[PDB]
């Protein structure tokens, strides 16, 4: 009687649907990825043994411009092609609005789940489907789909959630991990939750992230078999064993897919690991699933005409960093800076809106979209210095990344002080930036309102937002205006760590 129980899991996908360049692997000059090339792994182990699941933790939106340009409608229609036996919902299906989202994932034919999201000052949940179990060749799985509170309310634009908030995490897990006990087989939580990603052209070495948060929530529950995390974009090559719970990931974007084989036994109920491996999808390994890849080909195909349109061009690869400057985030920067006019003296934006590199060459309206994804609005705002000096030691905790700054702003942190005391220099046009004098400041909604922790623009006066003109209209428009790509933009390290 004893099974190979087969799970196979993916998280934080980001749209990113077909084959793609990463600047840190084979130095950018090998595909990896490729949804069409994992329909075929998962098609393929699932023609193998019968009791094989596919999961996902989230993110499935937002990255390249087919998730922007359609709300994520193009990135459901692509999954509906693949054999996913469950997912939950993270932060970026919000991106586009909670109303979209249960428009989008509506039309999914493959089973969703989310268990504590809900309507604030109620108790009406957000999803209708906590939980699931799927049952293959006499074994059932009952999958839970959970969002972080503390992520959800980091990471998810104030503008989008308005009137829903996720509530603890821990707490609903272990009622659903109560009311699964006797029905099922194996109990699998798929959780978003913990620290964001980084977003970066170096990899690695750009801002530590680890799975911390994983791992306190494994331990502050009885009776979970898996925890399948998305969120910090960290793939364990290795389960991570908490208590008797094993913790898997992936490094995000269709980088890896991970497969764990369990020896099951129902008779003497027990689980031990048998194989596992977190496999590198390398494009050229791989045939693509052909009704994956026409789906895919037959969207691009309707975009193509919005998409192809050359903005600008550049000598050389514009790139990011989350824990200092880079030319995406100056030119980012600058454009924000150049599209408010008027009085305004300087612009901030946030690393972690800066999603993918431009390549060299002539740059395509895609490909600003694909960078700069998000319904971000433009927002001028007055601040004082004391409180742009909060948001710079905010930065430099890189819990979320330092701000990216416009040119004449100069901010020099020192990343071995602690918390909260780690800027070194702040000036702008080579003056301190003073406590009590008031700046002209612009940068974009989601950090306007708060998001990924930068709470003192919350407390900026004189506010006004534009309606509908985004981070990407104020690129290409920065472009359109005359403007091009400097020598100072791109080697220009306005934000640095000084350690
Ligand atoms: O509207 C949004 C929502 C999220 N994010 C970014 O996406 C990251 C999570 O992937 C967050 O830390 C934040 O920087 C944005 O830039 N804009
Ligand atoms: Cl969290
Ligand atoms: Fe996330
Ligand atoms: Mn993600």
Redesign the pocket.
Known sequence: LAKDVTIIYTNDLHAHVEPYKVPWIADGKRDIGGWANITTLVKQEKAKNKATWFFDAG?YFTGPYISSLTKGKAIIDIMNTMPFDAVTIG??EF?HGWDNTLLQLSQAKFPIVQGNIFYQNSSKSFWDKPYTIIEKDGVKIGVIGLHGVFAFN????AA?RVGIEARDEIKWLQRYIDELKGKVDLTVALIHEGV??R?SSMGGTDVRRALDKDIQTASQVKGLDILITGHAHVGTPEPIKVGNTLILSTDSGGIDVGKLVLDYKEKPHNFTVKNFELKTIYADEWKPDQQTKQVIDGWNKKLDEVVQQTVAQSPVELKRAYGESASLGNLAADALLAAAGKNTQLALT????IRNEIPAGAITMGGVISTFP???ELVTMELTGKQLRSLMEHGASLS??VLQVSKGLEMKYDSSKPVGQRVITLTLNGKPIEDATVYHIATQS?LADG??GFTAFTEGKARNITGGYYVYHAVVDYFKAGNTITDEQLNGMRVKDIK
């Open positions: 993110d932060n970026h991106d980091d990471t998810v634009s989008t964001p990603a977003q946030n690393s972690g809106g998000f319904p971000n979320n990344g989601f998001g990924d």
